[PDB]
Amino acid sequence: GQLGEVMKESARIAYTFARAFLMQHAPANDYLVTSHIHLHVPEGATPKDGPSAGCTIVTALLSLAMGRPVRQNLAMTGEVSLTGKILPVGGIKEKTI
Amino acid sequence: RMYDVTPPGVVMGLAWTAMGGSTLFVETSLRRPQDKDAKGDKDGSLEVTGQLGEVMKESARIAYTFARAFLMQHAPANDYLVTSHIHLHVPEGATPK
């Protein structure tokens, strides 16, 4: 999805956090570490806000892993830390409208 | 200070960034189940991340090898390092020098 390189680093971080969360939670499952996966982020975010999508990403992957749907109409945003801390994002008022 | 209790495998580290100085954390974690084979003999390859520069890549491998030696010199019964893959993440910010 016409990724910028900073998003590429963010993506790899979120990926590794997914891989860690699974074995820490439900070791018997192994979907992530044993399979290839395509992931698509639609373009549109301005570059400075780019990383902010990352908190969605990890929830995406986990949904695929167990295969259960996410709970409906639960929009989210954030920024993931490689150890589960989350960080402030900018421009909140536009997002909320 | 994002983490305060510092759960295993995360360490604080000072960094002389381009402006001022900041206490960026360093983090690591497993990337596969470790006991893939009780007889298994495969190098526990590392995977560095965080917009690494190549000089840092050489430094990282050096430090990795020193860890690998220190365990067997200290507590031989443990074999965690040589028998498992590991993701490691150094947050960006340090000036190259």
Side-chain angles (χ1 to χ4, degrees), chain A residues 48-56 76-81 85-96:
Chain A
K48 174 259 293 178
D49 198 2
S52 49
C55 170
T56 65
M76 69 181 66
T77 176
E79 172 41 77
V80 74
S81 53
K85 203 79 179 188
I86 302 166
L87 280 164
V89 306
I92 297 86
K93 168 172 183 176
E94 304 76 358
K95 290 194 203 168
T96 303

mmCIF file with all atom_site columns, all heavy atoms in Angstrom, chain A residues 48-56 76-81 85-96:
data_model
loop_
_atom_site.group_PDB
_atom_site.id
_atom_site.type_symbol
_atom_site.label_atom_id
_atom_site.label_alt_id
_atom_site.label_comp_id
_atom_site.label_asym_id
_atom_site.label_entity_id
_atom_site.label_seq_id
_atom_site.pdbx_PDB_ins_code
_atom_site.Cartn_x
_atom_site.Cartn_y
_atom_site.Cartn_z
_atom_site.occupancy
_atom_site.B_iso_or_equiv
_atom_site.pdbx_formal_charge
_atom_site.auth_seq_id
_atom_site.auth_comp_id
_atom_site.auth_asym_id
_atom_site.auth_atom_id
_atom_site.pdbx_PDB_model_num
ATOM 1   N N   . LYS A 1 48 ? 3.974   12.402 8.696  1.00 0.00 ? 48 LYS A N   1
ATOM 2   C CA  . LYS A 1 48 ? 4.299   12.639 10.092 1.00 0.00 ? 48 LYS A CA  1
ATOM 3   C C   . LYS A 1 48 ? 3.406   11.836 11.010 1.00 0.00 ? 48 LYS A C   1
ATOM 4   O O   . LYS A 1 48 ? 3.842   11.426 12.085 1.00 0.00 ? 48 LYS A O   1
ATOM 5   C CB  . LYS A 1 48 ? 4.168   14.117 10.414 1.00 0.00 ? 48 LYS A CB  1
ATOM 6   C CG  . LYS A 1 48 ? 4.340   14.467 11.896 1.00 0.00 ? 48 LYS A CG  1
ATOM 7   C CD  . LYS A 1 48 ? 3.026   14.707 12.649 1.00 0.00 ? 48 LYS A CD  1
ATOM 8   C CE  . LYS A 1 48 ? 2.261   15.950 12.211 1.00 0.00 ? 48 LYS A CE  1
ATOM 9   N NZ  . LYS A 1 48 ? 0.981   16.054 12.961 1.00 0.00 ? 48 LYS A NZ  1
ATOM 10  N N   . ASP A 1 49 ? 2.163   11.603 10.605 1.00 0.00 ? 49 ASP A N   1
ATOM 11  C CA  . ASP A 1 49 ? 1.263   10.789 11.395 1.00 0.00 ? 49 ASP A CA  1
ATOM 12  C C   . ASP A 1 49 ? 1.412   9.311  11.095 1.00 0.00 ? 49 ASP A C   1
ATOM 13  O O   . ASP A 1 49 ? 0.758   8.515  11.758 1.00 0.00 ? 49 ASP A O   1
ATOM 14  C CB  . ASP A 1 49 ? -0.197  11.158 11.124 1.00 0.00 ? 49 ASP A CB  1
ATOM 15  C CG  . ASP A 1 49 ? -1.145  10.667 12.212 1.00 0.00 ? 49 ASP A CG  1
ATOM 16  O OD1 . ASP A 1 49 ? -0.709  10.068 13.201 1.00 0.00 ? 49 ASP A OD1 1
ATOM 17  O OD2 . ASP A 1 49 ? -2.361  10.765 12.042 1.00 0.00 ? 49 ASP A OD2 1
ATOM 18  N N   . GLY A 1 50 ? 2.235   8.931  10.114 1.00 0.00 ? 50 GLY A N   1
ATOM 19  C CA  . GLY A 1 50 ? 2.311   7.576  9.613  1.00 0.00 ? 50 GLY A CA  1
ATOM 20  C C   . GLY A 1 50 ? 2.295   6.464  10.638 1.00 0.00 ? 50 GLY A C   1
ATOM 21  O O   . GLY A 1 50 ? 1.490   5.540  10.529 1.00 0.00 ? 50 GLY A O   1
ATOM 22  N N   . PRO A 1 51 ? 3.165   6.520  11.639 1.00 0.00 ? 51 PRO A N   1
ATOM 23  C CA  . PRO A 1 51 ? 3.215   5.439  12.621 1.00 0.00 ? 51 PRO A CA  1
ATOM 24  C C   . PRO A 1 51 ? 1.918   5.198  13.358 1.00 0.00 ? 51 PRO A C   1
ATOM 25  O O   . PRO A 1 51 ? 1.721   4.083  13.835 1.00 0.00 ? 51 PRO A O   1
ATOM 26  C CB  . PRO A 1 51 ? 4.336   5.880  13.553 1.00 0.00 ? 51 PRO A CB  1
ATOM 27  C CG  . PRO A 1 51 ? 5.146   6.754  12.765 1.00 0.00 ? 51 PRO A CG  1
ATOM 28  C CD  . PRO A 1 51 ? 4.257   7.471  11.863 1.00 0.00 ? 51 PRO A CD  1
ATOM 29  N N   . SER A 1 52 ? 1.024   6.188  13.452 1.00 0.00 ? 52 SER A N   1
ATOM 30  C CA  . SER A 1 52 ? -0.174  6.079  14.283 1.00 0.00 ? 52 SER A CA  1
ATOM 31  C C   . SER A 1 52 ? -1.065  4.918  13.893 1.00 0.00 ? 52 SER A C   1
ATOM 32  O O   . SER A 1 52 ? -1.951  4.555  14.661 1.00 0.00 ? 52 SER A O   1
ATOM 33  C CB  . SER A 1 52 ? -1.047  7.317  14.225 1.00 0.00 ? 52 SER A CB  1
ATOM 34  O OG  . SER A 1 52 ? -1.280  7.733  12.901 1.00 0.00 ? 52 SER A OG  1
ATOM 35  N N   . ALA A 1 53 ? -0.950  4.401  12.683 1.00 0.00 ? 53 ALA A N   1
ATOM 36  C CA  . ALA A 1 53 ? -1.806  3.282  12.359 1.00 0.00 ? 53 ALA A CA  1
ATOM 37  C C   . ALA A 1 53 ? -1.415  2.020  13.099 1.00 0.00 ? 53 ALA A C   1
ATOM 38  O O   . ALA A 1 53 ? -2.234  1.104  13.153 1.00 0.00 ? 53 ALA A O   1
ATOM 39  C CB  . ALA A 1 53 ? -1.756  3.017  10.862 1.00 0.00 ? 53 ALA A CB  1
ATOM 40  N N   . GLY A 1 54 ? -0.219  1.972  13.694 1.00 0.00 ? 54 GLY A N   1
ATOM 41  C CA  . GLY A 1 54 ? 0.366   0.710  14.082 1.00 0.00 ? 54 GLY A CA  1
ATOM 42  C C   . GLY A 1 54 ? -0.458  -0.057 15.088 1.00 0.00 ? 54 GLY A C   1
ATOM 43  O O   . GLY A 1 54 ? -0.458  -1.284 15.072 1.00 0.00 ? 54 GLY A O   1
ATOM 44  N N   . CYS A 1 55 ? -1.134  0.636  15.994 1.00 0.00 ? 55 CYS A N   1
ATOM 45  C CA  . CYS A 1 55 ? -1.893  -0.093 16.992 1.00 0.00 ? 55 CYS A CA  1
ATOM 46  C C   . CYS A 1 55 ? -3.002  -0.905 16.364 1.00 0.00 ? 55 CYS A C   1
ATOM 47  O O   . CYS A 1 55 ? -3.379  -1.946 16.900 1.00 0.00 ? 55 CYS A O   1
ATOM 48  C CB  . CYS A 1 55 ? -2.471  0.865  18.009 1.00 0.00 ? 55 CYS A CB  1
ATOM 49  S SG  . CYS A 1 55 ? -3.649  0.116  19.125 1.00 0.00 ? 55 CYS A SG  1
ATOM 50  N N   . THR A 1 56 ? -3.561  -0.445 15.242 1.00 0.00 ? 56 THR A N   1
ATOM 51  C CA  . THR A 1 56 ? -4.546  -1.271 14.561 1.00 0.00 ? 56 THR A CA  1
ATOM 52  C C   . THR A 1 56 ? -3.913  -2.552 14.074 1.00 0.00 ? 56 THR A C   1
ATOM 53  O O   . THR A 1 56 ? -4.509  -3.628 14.197 1.00 0.00 ? 56 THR A O   1
ATOM 54  C CB  . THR A 1 56 ? -5.139  -0.570 13.354 1.00 0.00 ? 56 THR A CB  1
ATOM 55  O OG1 . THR A 1 56 ? -4.118  -0.375 12.387 1.00 0.00 ? 56 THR A OG1 1
ATOM 56  C CG2 . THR A 1 56 ? -5.718  0.762  13.702 1.00 0.00 ? 56 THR A CG2 1
ATOM 57  N N   . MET A 1 76 ? -10.130 2.191  16.341 1.00 0.00 ? 76 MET A N   1
ATOM 58  C CA  . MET A 1 76 ? -9.036  2.405  17.282 1.00 0.00 ? 76 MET A CA  1
ATOM 59  C C   . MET A 1 76 ? -7.886  3.124  16.613 1.00 0.00 ? 76 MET A C   1
ATOM 60  O O   . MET A 1 76 ? -7.828  3.255  15.397 1.00 0.00 ? 76 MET A O   1
ATOM 61  C CB  . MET A 1 76 ? -8.530  1.092  17.874 1.00 0.00 ? 76 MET A CB  1
ATOM 62  C CG  . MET A 1 76 ? -7.809  0.167  16.919 1.00 0.00 ? 76 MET A CG  1
ATOM 63  S SD  . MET A 1 76 ? -7.268  -1.353 17.676 1.00 0.00 ? 76 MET A SD  1
ATOM 64  C CE  . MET A 1 76 ? -8.824  -2.115 18.065 1.00 0.00 ? 76 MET A CE  1
ATOM 65  N N   . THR A 1 77 ? -6.951  3.562  17.434 1.00 0.00 ? 77 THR A N   1
ATOM 66  C CA  . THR A 1 77 ? -5.709  4.133  16.952 1.00 0.00 ? 77 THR A CA  1
ATOM 67  C C   . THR A 1 77 ? -4.745  4.165  18.117 1.00 0.00 ? 77 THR A C   1
ATOM 68  O O   . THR A 1 77 ? -5.137  4.009  19.269 1.00 0.00 ? 77 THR A O   1
ATOM 69  C CB  . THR A 1 77 ? -5.875  5.524  16.375 1.00 0.00 ? 77 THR A CB  1
ATOM 70  O OG1 . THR A 1 77 ? -4.581  6.014  16.036 1.00 0.00 ? 77 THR A OG1 1
ATOM 71  C CG2 . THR A 1 77 ? -6.505  6.481  17.357 1.00 0.00 ? 77 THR A CG2 1
ATOM 72  N N   . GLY A 1 78 ? -3.480  4.386  17.808 1.00 0.00 ? 78 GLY A N   1
ATOM 73  C CA  . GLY A 1 78 ? -2.471  4.357  18.839 1.00 0.00 ? 78 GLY A CA  1
ATOM 74  C C   . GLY A 1 78 ? -1.109  4.273  18.198 1.00 0.00 ? 78 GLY A C   1
ATOM 75  O O   . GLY A 1 78 ? -0.939  4.611  17.040 1.00 0.00 ? 78 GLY A O   1
ATOM 76  N N   . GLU A 1 79 ? -0.126  3.937  19.005 1.00 0.00 ? 79 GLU A N   1
ATOM 77  C CA  . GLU A 1 79 ? 1.220   3.772  18.494 1.00 0.00 ? 79 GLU A CA  1
ATOM 78  C C   . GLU A 1 79 ? 1.931   2.789  19.400 1.00 0.00 ? 79 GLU A C   1
ATOM 79  O O   . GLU A 1 79 ? 2.050   3.065  20.590 1.00 0.00 ? 79 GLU A O   1
ATOM 80  C CB  . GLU A 1 79 ? 1.928   5.111  18.460 1.00 0.00 ? 79 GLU A CB  1
ATOM 81  C CG  . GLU A 1 79 ? 3.382   5.066  18.142 1.00 0.00 ? 79 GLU A CG  1
ATOM 82  C CD  . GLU A 1 79 ? 3.685   4.088  17.066 1.00 0.00 ? 79 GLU A CD  1
ATOM 83  O OE1 . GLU A 1 79 ? 3.432   4.414  15.903 1.00 0.00 ? 79 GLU A OE1 1
ATOM 84  O OE2 . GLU A 1 79 ? 4.097   2.962  17.392 1.00 0.00 ? 79 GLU A OE2 1
ATOM 85  N N   . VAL A 1 80 ? 2.442   1.685  18.842 1.00 0.00 ? 80 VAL A N   1
ATOM 86  C CA  . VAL A 1 80 ? 2.918   0.577  19.658 1.00 0.00 ? 80 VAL A CA  1
ATOM 87  C C   . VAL A 1 80 ? 4.423   0.655  19.839 1.00 0.00 ? 80 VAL A C   1
ATOM 88  O O   . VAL A 1 80 ? 5.162   1.112  18.970 1.00 0.00 ? 80 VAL A O   1
ATOM 89  C CB  . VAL A 1 80 ? 2.496   -0.755 19.035 1.00 0.00 ? 80 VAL A CB  1
ATOM 90  C CG1 . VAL A 1 80 ? 3.326   -1.059 17.818 1.00 0.00 ? 80 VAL A CG1 1
ATOM 91  C CG2 . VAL A 1 80 ? 2.573   -1.857 20.046 1.00 0.00 ? 80 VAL A CG2 1
ATOM 92  N N   . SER A 1 81 ? 4.876   0.116  20.959 1.00 0.00 ? 81 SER A N   1
ATOM 93  C CA  . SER A 1 81 ? 6.204   0.352  21.514 1.00 0.00 ? 81 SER A CA  1
ATOM 94  C C   . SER A 1 81 ? 7.192   -0.797 21.429 1.00 0.00 ? 81 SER A C   1
ATOM 95  O O   . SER A 1 81 ? 8.283   -0.662 21.972 1.00 0.00 ? 81 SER A O   1
ATOM 96  C CB  . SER A 1 81 ? 6.076   0.723  22.989 1.00 0.00 ? 81 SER A CB  1
ATOM 97  O OG  . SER A 1 81 ? 5.306   -0.239 23.691 1.00 0.00 ? 81 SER A OG  1
ATOM 98  N N   . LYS A 1 85 ? 3.741   -0.952 25.500 1.00 0.00 ? 85 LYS A N   1
ATOM 99  C CA  . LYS A 1 85 ? 3.401   0.399  25.882 1.00 0.00 ? 85 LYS A CA  1
ATOM 100 C C   . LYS A 1 85 ? 2.843   1.093  24.662 1.00 0.00 ? 85 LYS A C   1
ATOM 101 O O   . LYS A 1 85 ? 3.192   0.740  23.540 1.00 0.00 ? 85 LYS A O   1
ATOM 102 C CB  . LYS A 1 85 ? 4.629   1.143  26.359 1.00 0.00 ? 85 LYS A CB  1
ATOM 103 C CG  . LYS A 1 85 ? 4.351   2.304  27.266 1.00 0.00 ? 85 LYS A CG  1
ATOM 104 C CD  . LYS A 1 85 ? 4.068   1.809  28.666 1.00 0.00 ? 85 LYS A CD  1
ATOM 105 C CE  . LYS A 1 85 ? 3.813   2.930  29.621 1.00 0.00 ? 85 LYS A CE  1
ATOM 106 N NZ  . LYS A 1 85 ? 3.748   2.393  31.001 1.00 0.00 ? 85 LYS A NZ  1
ATOM 107 N N   . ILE A 1 86 ? 1.944   2.050  24.881 1.00 0.00 ? 86 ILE A N   1
ATOM 108 C CA  . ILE A 1 86 ? 1.344   2.821  23.805 1.00 0.00 ? 86 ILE A CA  1
ATOM 109 C C   . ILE A 1 86 ? 1.777   4.262  24.019 1.00 0.00 ? 86 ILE A C   1
ATOM 110 O O   . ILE A 1 86 ? 2.120   4.658  25.127 1.00 0.00 ? 86 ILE A O   1
ATOM 111 C CB  . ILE A 1 86 ? -0.191  2.662  23.780 1.00 0.00 ? 86 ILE A CB  1
ATOM 112 C CG1 . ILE A 1 86 ? -0.575  1.191  23.635 1.00 0.00 ? 86 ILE A CG1 1
ATOM 113 C CG2 . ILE A 1 86 ? -0.781  3.377  22.606 1.00 0.00 ? 86 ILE A CG2 1
ATOM 114 C CD1 . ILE A 1 86 ? -2.001  0.902  23.936 1.00 0.00 ? 86 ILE A CD1 1
ATOM 115 N N   . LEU A 1 87 ? 1.739   5.046  22.956 1.00 0.00 ? 87 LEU A N   1
ATOM 116 C CA  . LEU A 1 87 ? 2.301   6.382  22.913 1.00 0.00 ? 87 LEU A CA  1
ATOM 117 C C   . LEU A 1 87 ? 1.272   7.363  22.380 1.00 0.00 ? 87 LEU A C   1
ATOM 118 O O   . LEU A 1 87 ? 0.335   6.960  21.693 1.00 0.00 ? 87 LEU A O   1
ATOM 119 C CB  . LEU A 1 87 ? 3.522   6.328  21.999 1.00 0.00 ? 87 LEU A CB  1
ATOM 120 C CG  . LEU A 1 87 ? 4.756   5.775  22.694 1.00 0.00 ? 87 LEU A CG  1
ATOM 121 C CD1 . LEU A 1 87 ? 5.784   5.398  21.660 1.00 0.00 ? 87 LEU A CD1 1
ATOM 122 C CD2 . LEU A 1 87 ? 5.361   6.758  23.664 1.00 0.00 ? 87 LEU A CD2 1
ATOM 123 N N   . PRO A 1 88 ? 1.385   8.647  22.705 1.00 0.00 ? 88 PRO A N   1
ATOM 124 C CA  . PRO A 1 88 ? 0.417   9.614  22.194 1.00 0.00 ? 88 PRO A CA  1
ATOM 125 C C   . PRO A 1 88 ? 0.448   9.736  20.685 1.00 0.00 ? 88 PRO A C   1
ATOM 126 O O   . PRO A 1 88 ? 1.496   9.602  20.062 1.00 0.00 ? 88 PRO A O   1
ATOM 127 C CB  . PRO A 1 88 ? 0.860   10.916 22.842 1.00 0.00 ? 88 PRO A CB  1
ATOM 128 C CG  . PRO A 1 88 ? 2.249   10.738 23.042 1.00 0.00 ? 88 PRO A CG  1
ATOM 129 C CD  . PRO A 1 88 ? 2.468   9.336  23.402 1.00 0.00 ? 88 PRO A CD  1
ATOM 130 N N   . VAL A 1 89 ? -0.725  9.990  20.109 1.00 0.00 ? 89 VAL A N   1
ATOM 131 C CA  . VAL A 1 89 ? -0.884  10.326 18.700 1.00 0.00 ? 89 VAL A CA  1
ATOM 132 C C   . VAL A 1 89 ? -1.369  11.762 18.606 1.00 0.00 ? 89 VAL A C   1
ATOM 133 O O   . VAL A 1 89 ? -1.900  12.319 19.566 1.00 0.00 ? 89 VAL A O   1
ATOM 134 C CB  . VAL A 1 89 ? -1.846  9.376  17.975 1.00 0.00 ? 89 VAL A CB  1
ATOM 135 C CG1 . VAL A 1 89 ? -1.410  7.950  18.163 1.00 0.00 ? 89 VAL A CG1 1
ATOM 136 C CG2 . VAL A 1 89 ? -3.269  9.541  18.473 1.00 0.00 ? 89 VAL A CG2 1
ATOM 137 N N   . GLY A 1 90 ? -1.201  12.358 17.428 1.00 0.00 ? 90 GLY A N   1
ATOM 138 C CA  . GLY A 1 90 ? -1.563  13.740 17.201 1.00 0.00 ? 90 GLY A CA  1
ATOM 139 C C   . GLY A 1 90 ? -2.864  13.941 16.438 1.00 0.00 ? 90 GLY A C   1
ATOM 140 O O   . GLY A 1 90 ? -3.394  13.030 15.820 1.00 0.00 ? 90 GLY A O   1
ATOM 141 N N   . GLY A 1 91 ? -3.378  15.164 16.496 1.00 0.00 ? 91 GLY A N   1
ATOM 142 C CA  . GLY A 1 91 ? -4.529  15.543 15.694 1.00 0.00 ? 91 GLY A CA  1
ATOM 143 C C   . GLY A 1 91 ? -5.842  14.915 16.087 1.00 0.00 ? 91 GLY A C   1
ATOM 144 O O   . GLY A 1 91 ? -6.618  14.540 15.207 1.00 0.00 ? 91 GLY A O   1
ATOM 145 N N   . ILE A 1 92 ? -6.088  14.741 17.377 1.00 0.00 ? 92 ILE A N   1
ATOM 146 C CA  . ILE A 1 92 ? -7.189  13.896 17.796 1.00 0.00 ? 92 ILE A CA  1
ATOM 147 C C   . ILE A 1 92 ? -8.544  14.438 17.385 1.00 0.00 ? 92 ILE A C   1
ATOM 148 O O   . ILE A 1 92 ? -9.478  13.656 17.174 1.00 0.00 ? 92 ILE A O   1
ATOM 149 C CB  . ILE A 1 92 ? -7.134  13.699 19.319 1.00 0.00 ? 92 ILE A CB  1
ATOM 150 C CG1 . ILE A 1 92 ? -5.849  12.958 19.718 1.00 0.00 ? 92 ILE A CG1 1
ATOM 151 C CG2 . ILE A 1 92 ? -8.377  12.975 19.830 1.00 0.00 ? 92 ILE A CG2 1
ATOM 152 C CD1 . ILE A 1 92 ? -4.617  13.847 19.925 1.00 0.00 ? 92 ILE A CD1 1
ATOM 153 N N   . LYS A 1 93 ? -8.708  15.758 17.321 1.00 0.00 ? 93 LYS A N   1
ATOM 154 C CA  . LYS A 1 93 ? -10.061 16.271 17.139 1.00 0.00 ? 93 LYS A CA  1
ATOM 155 C C   . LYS A 1 93 ? -10.623 15.901 15.768 1.00 0.00 ? 93 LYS A C   1
ATOM 156 O O   . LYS A 1 93 ? -11.790 15.495 15.654 1.00 0.00 ? 93 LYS A O   1
ATOM 157 C CB  . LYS A 1 93 ? -10.118 17.773 17.379 1.00 0.00 ? 93 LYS A CB  1
ATOM 158 C CG  . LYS A 1 93 ? -11.418 18.400 16.921 1.00 0.00 ? 93 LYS A CG  1
ATOM 159 C CD  . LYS A 1 93 ? -11.530 19.826 17.340 1.00 0.00 ? 93 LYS A CD  1
ATOM 160 C CE  . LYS A 1 93 ? -12.876 20.363 16.904 1.00 0.00 ? 93 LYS A CE  1
ATOM 161 N NZ  . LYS A 1 93 ? -13.105 21.749 17.359 1.00 0.00 ? 93 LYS A NZ  1
ATOM 162 N N   . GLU A 1 94 ? -9.783  15.975 14.731 1.00 0.00 ? 94 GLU A N   1
ATOM 163 C CA  . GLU A 1 94 ? -10.246 15.585 13.406 1.00 0.00 ? 94 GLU A CA  1
ATOM 164 C C   . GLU A 1 94 ? -10.588 14.124 13.403 1.00 0.00 ? 94 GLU A C   1
ATOM 165 O O   . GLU A 1 94 ? -11.528 13.697 12.722 1.00 0.00 ? 94 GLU A O   1
ATOM 166 C CB  . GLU A 1 94 ? -9.224  15.879 12.315 1.00 0.00 ? 94 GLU A CB  1
ATOM 167 C CG  . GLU A 1 94 ? -8.739  17.309 12.182 1.00 0.00 ? 94 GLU A CG  1
ATOM 168 C CD  . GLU A 1 94 ? -7.760  17.740 13.224 1.00 0.00 ? 94 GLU A CD  1
ATOM 169 O OE1 . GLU A 1 94 ? -7.466  16.905 14.105 1.00 0.00 ? 94 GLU A OE1 1
ATOM 170 O OE2 . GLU A 1 94 ? -7.277  18.888 13.166 1.00 0.00 ? 94 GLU A OE2 1
ATOM 171 N N   . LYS A 1 95 ? -9.800  13.341 14.119 1.00 0.00 ? 95 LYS A N   1
ATOM 172 C CA  . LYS A 1 95 ? -10.020 11.923 14.089 1.00 0.00 ? 95 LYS A CA  1
ATOM 173 C C   . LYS A 1 95 ? -11.372 11.646 14.691 1.00 0.00 ? 95 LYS A C   1
ATOM 174 O O   . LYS A 1 95 ? -12.151 10.868 14.144 1.00 0.00 ? 95 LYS A O   1
ATOM 175 C CB  . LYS A 1 95 ? -8.898  11.215 14.818 1.00 0.00 ? 95 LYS A CB  1
ATOM 176 C CG  . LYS A 1 95 ? -7.609  11.282 14.079 1.00 0.00 ? 95 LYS A CG  1
ATOM 177 C CD  . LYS A 1 95 ? -6.627  10.297 14.642 1.00 0.00 ? 95 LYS A CD  1
ATOM 178 C CE  . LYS A 1 95 ? -5.212  10.687 14.350 1.00 0.00 ? 95 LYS A CE  1
ATOM 179 N NZ  . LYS A 1 95 ? -4.295  9.866  15.145 1.00 0.00 ? 95 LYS A NZ  1
ATOM 180 N N   . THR A 1 96 ? -11.678 12.298 15.809 1.00 0.00 ? 96 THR A N   1
ATOM 181 C CA  . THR A 1 96 ? -12.925 11.989 16.473 1.00 0.00 ? 96 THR A CA  1
ATOM 182 C C   . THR A 1 96 ? -14.114 12.375 15.624 1.00 0.00 ? 96 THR A C   1
ATOM 183 O O   . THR A 1 96 ? -15.113 11.652 15.604 1.00 0.00 ? 96 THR A O   1
ATOM 184 C CB  . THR A 1 96 ? -13.006 12.690 17.804 1.00 0.00 ? 96 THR A CB  1
ATOM 185 O OG1 . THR A 1 96 ? -11.887 12.303 18.596 1.00 0.00 ? 96 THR A OG1 1
ATOM 186 C CG2 . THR A 1 96 ? -14.269 12.311 18.518 1.00 0.00 ? 96 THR A CG2 1
#
